Amino acid sequence: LTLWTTLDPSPNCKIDIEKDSKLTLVLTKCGSQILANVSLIIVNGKFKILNNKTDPSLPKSFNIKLLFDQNGVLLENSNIEKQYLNFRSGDKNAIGFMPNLLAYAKATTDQSKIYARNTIYGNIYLDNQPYNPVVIKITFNNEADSAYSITFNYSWTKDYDNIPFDSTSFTFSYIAQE
Amino acid sequence: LTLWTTLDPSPNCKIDIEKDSKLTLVLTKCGSQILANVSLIIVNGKFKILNNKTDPSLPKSFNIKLLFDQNGVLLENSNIEKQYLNFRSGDKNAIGFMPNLLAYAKATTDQSKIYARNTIYGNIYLDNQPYNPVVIKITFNNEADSAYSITFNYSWTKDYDNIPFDSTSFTFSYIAQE
Amino acid sequence: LTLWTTLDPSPNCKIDIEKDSKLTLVLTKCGSQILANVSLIIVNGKFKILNNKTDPSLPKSFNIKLLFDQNGVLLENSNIEKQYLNFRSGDKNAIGFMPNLLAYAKATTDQSKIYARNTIYGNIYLDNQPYNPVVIKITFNNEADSAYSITFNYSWTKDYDNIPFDSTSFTFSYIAQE
């Protein structure tokens, strides 16, 4: 069972401006675990070409938030509209793809933090060069006004000088709600 | 088919003192490969808060050893008792979850080493901060007085100063015995 | 469904000289995604022991190329002969294991580059030591005179001084053609 984006380069995401990016995301249910594959191409807007070195007002991090309602359907405040995730031809209800509430509990309180296990860290690379690292930080179930969430935080420390945000691929897994 | 711990924060592991830690471990059989998801929270004992900077006697590494008998059931000398791994509701014999003996051969001799392929390295992070790295080193079939083993070695180089051992999640895979 | 090498240490690969290496590669079909496990042992030839420090003519990178024909069968110019990948006993046509053409498009032109999403980066370690890093760079569908390809580029920056090329294991996933 697969929940996925399209695989073409057609944008499906708003980081800065409408349709400025393509998040390619493939979620494969393997029983209790979701096997996840993600990449990002930024096609337009201020993050298409990282110009941190000549624009000190440009941020060195952003989020792509997948905020799910209790049915496992994306909410309006997500970076991607709900039409852009679909099931692959057979061989709504996407609760089976949602991050497990017991493994990845919400913050209990307003003064409370999630456990670190709700997060995965990985290194990905811009423009297919190992000297352009970006930290991809993936956090489950840590967003206000949502039933479930997957948040992709992208951050970097180098003052990049006209580097296209064309990211390498990253694989990870998380424990499924059901 | 899944072999797993509970997903709650309840401790199941002894690193230093009884029940000082929760190793959350999810093993999903995907035919010839086990898809594995692991995190660690240390709740009590000397490693709950890393105080290397003010306690030079505190180690900068420890092991969590899963020593299996030839039936794929944990042995007494493991860091976790055999009750703490169970099969997930259907849709002992856990030999299907054991690390493959041909791919991950035991040391032949007393002067002999395993092949490096018996090991995976990953970086995880304490307290959900990228400046708190720990090396997670996972080795198959390298333990005395066991049929199979999975060893999780955690090590670090920074003299951490009151950092909670609350680890981010890590995904890996290994080749199954059958 | 699994497409795999043998798991023993028997060489199956030519980097420098005939049969100088064993690439252990396990490809598990999980619906739309291939779960991949890879390791490399170099048994003979100039890369068996990295002597960069005392042989400045020795390269600090090499490729293992799996060039597939449109049937998903290895081509002669690959580093491995087509006999060395087989299906695991049931429970040619390997197009189901091929990297997806829409997700991992070929270079359009002669002046054109692939998208970065065609590549995965990982760090592996020689002789099971964390101070012997090698960058493993895996690229899909980027080779001339092939229908599909998986290229494993191994590179390093340290002038290694008699370090055996006995690599740790690495897991990754990619999107399947069908």
What does the DSSP assignment read for B23-53?
Answer: EEEEEEEETTEEEEEEEEEE-SSTTSEEETT
Look at A166 and C116 and tell me if their CB atoms are within 8 Å: yes
The amino acid occupying position C132 is: N
The label of the residue with tokens 């990297």 reads C99
Q: How far apart are CA A89 and CA A1, in angstroms?
A: 9
Strands in A5-160 per DSSP E? 21-30, 33-42, 49-51, 61-68, 86-87, 119-125, 133-140, 148-155
Q: What is the CB neighbour count within 10 angstroms for residue A55?
A: 12
Smallest CA-to-CA distance from B88 within B28, B177, B34 is with B28
Residue A31's nearest CA partner among C30, C172, C177, B100 is: C30
CA distance C114 to chain B (A): 27
**Type of residue numbered C15:** I
Sign of CA dihedral A14, A17, A19, A23: negative
Tell me the chain B residues in contact with residue A119 when contact means C-beta distances shorter than 8 Å.
125, 128, 168-169
Rounded Cα–Cα distance for residues C130 and C134 (Å) = 10
Q: B39: which strand partners?
A: B24
**Contact call for residues B101 and B177 (beta carbons, < 8 A):** yes
Which of left, alpha, beta for B45 (phi over 0: left; psi -120 to 50: alpha)? left
Nearest CA-CA partner of A32 in B8, B6, B27 = B27
Q: What is the CA radius of gyration of chain B?
A: 16
The token duo for C176 is: 């399947």
- CA angle, residues A170, C23, C46, in degrees to nearest 5: 115
B93/B72 Cα distance (integer angstroms): 6
With contact defined as beta carbons under 8 Å apart, do C85 and C5 qualify? yes
* Tokens read off for B141: 């079939």
CA distance linking residue A41 with residue B29, whole number of Å: 33
The residue with tokens 């199979």 is B148
- Give the Cα separation of A24 and A41 in Å (integer): 8
Neighbours of chain C (3+ CB pairs under 8 A): A, B
**Experimental technique behind these coordinates:** X-ray
Chains that contact B by 3+ CB pairs under 8 Å?
A: A, C
Q: Find where tokens 């000082």 sit.
A: B20
Cα–chain center distance at A17: 17
Q: Do residues B25 and B2 lie in contact, with contact meaning Cβ atoms separated by under 8 Å? A: no
Count, in order, helices (H) and strands (E) of chain A: 0, 11
What whole-number distance in Å separates Cα of residue B35 and Cα of residue B29? Answer: 6
User: What DSSP state is assigned to residue A61?
Assistant: E
Q: Is B168 in CB contact (< 8 Å) with chain A?
A: yes
DSSP string, C88-100: -------GGGSBP
Report the C-alpha gap between A149 and A66 in whole angstroms.
Answer: 5
Q: What is the DSSP string of B58-98?
A: S-SEEEEEEEE-TTS-B-TTSSS-GGG-EE-------GGGS
- Provide, as residue numbers in chain B, all residues whose Cβ is less than 8 Å from the Cβ of A120: 168-171
Probe site for chain A from B26, B87, B129 (most A CB atoms < 10 A): B26
- B140's CB contacts (< 8 A; 6+ apart) are B99, B104, B118, B119, B148, B149, B150, B174
Measured between CB atoms, does A141 come within 8 Å of chain B?
no
Does A4 lie at the interface with C, CB-CB under 8 angstroms?
yes
User: CB of C167 within 8 Å of any CB in chain B?
Assistant: yes
Number of residue pairs across A and B with CB atoms under 8 Å? 74
Q: What is the phi-psi region of residue B22: left when phi exceeds 0, alpha when psi lies from -120 to 50, beta otherwise?
A: beta
Partner-chain contact C88 B32, CB within 8 Å: yes
Alpha-carbon distance A74 to A79, whole Å? 9
Judge whether A165 and A48 are in contact, CB under 8 Å: yes
Instruction: State the nearest Cα–Cα gap between C175 and chain A, in angstroms.
Output: 8
* Residue A96: strand, helix, or coil: helix
This PDB structure is determined at a resolution in Å of 1.6
- The answer to whether A124 and A136 are in contact (CB under 8 A) is yes
Q: Which of B32, B137, B173 is the closest to C171 by Cβ?
A: B173
Number of structural domains (chain B) is 1
Q: Which residue of B169, B172, B173, B174 to mutate against A (max A Cβ within 10 Å)? A: B169
Return left, alpha or beta for B19; rule: phi > 0 is left, psi -120 to 50 is alpha, else beta.
Answer: left
Q: What is the Cα–Cα distance from C130 to B120, expressed in whole angstroms? A: 11
HSE (CB half, 13 Å, CA atoms) of A65? Answer: 19
Other C-beta atoms lying within 10 Å of the C-beta of residue B87: 13
Provide the token pair at C133: 């890093």
- Can you say whether the dihedral through the CA atoms of A137, A138, A142, A146 is positive or negative? positive
Distance CA A140, CA A63 (A): 13
Give how far Cα C131 sits from Cα of A23, B16, B121, C128, C156, Å: 34, 28, 12, 9, 11
A157 Rama sector, left if φ>0, alpha if ψ -120 to 50, beta otherwise: alpha
φ and ψ at residue B83, rounded to 5 degrees: -70, -20
Whether A151 and A139 have beta carbons less than 8 Å apart is answered as yes
- Nearest residue on chain A to B33, judged by CA atoms? A30
Residue of B40, B50, B84, B54 lying closest to B66 (CA atoms): B84
- Partner residue facing A32 (CB), from B88, B124, B130: B88
| Residue ranges with strand state E in C7-143 | 21-30, 33-42, 49-51, 61-68, 86-87, 119-125, 133-140
Q: Which of B114, B68, B29 is nearest to C169 (CA)?
A: B114
**Chain A contact present for C116, CB below 8 A:** yes
Cα separation, C27 vs A101, whole angstroms: 31
> Where would I find the beta strands (DSSP E) of C109-160?
119-125, 133-140, 148-155
Q: How far apart are CA B85 and CA B17, in angstroms?
A: 20
Which of A173, A174, A177, A178 to probe the B interface (max B CBs under 10 A)? A173
CA A47/CA A44 separation, integer angstroms: 7
Exposure of B152 in the CB half-sphere (CA atoms within 13 A):
23
- Closest Cβ opposite residue A7 in set C31, C100, C135: C100
- 3-state class (DSSP) for residue A155: strand
Distance from A102 to chain B by nearest Cα, in Å?
Answer: 6
Give the residue from C5, C155, C143, C138 showing the smallest Cα distance to C80. Answer: C5
Q: Which long-range contacts (CB under 8 A, 24 or more apart) does A73-80 make?
A: A75/A145, A75/A146, A77/A145, A77/A146, A79/A13, A79/A14, A79/A15, A79/A23, A80/A12, A80/A13, A80/A14, A80/A23
Structure-token pair, residue B160: 């951490």
Q: Is C124 on the interface with B (CB under 8 A)?
A: yes
At residue C100, φ and ψ (nearest 5 deg) are -55, 130
Q: How many CB atoms lie within 10 A of CB C1?
A: 16
Give Cβ neighbours of residue B54 (< 8 Å, ≥ 6 apart): B161, B162
Q: What is the DSSP letter of C160?
A: -
Q: Are C117 and C103 in contact (CB under 8 A)?
A: yes
Residue A173 belongs to what H/E stretch?
strand A170-175
The rounded distance, in Å, linking the Cα atoms of B161 and B77 is 31
Q: Which domain holds residue A53?
A: 1-178
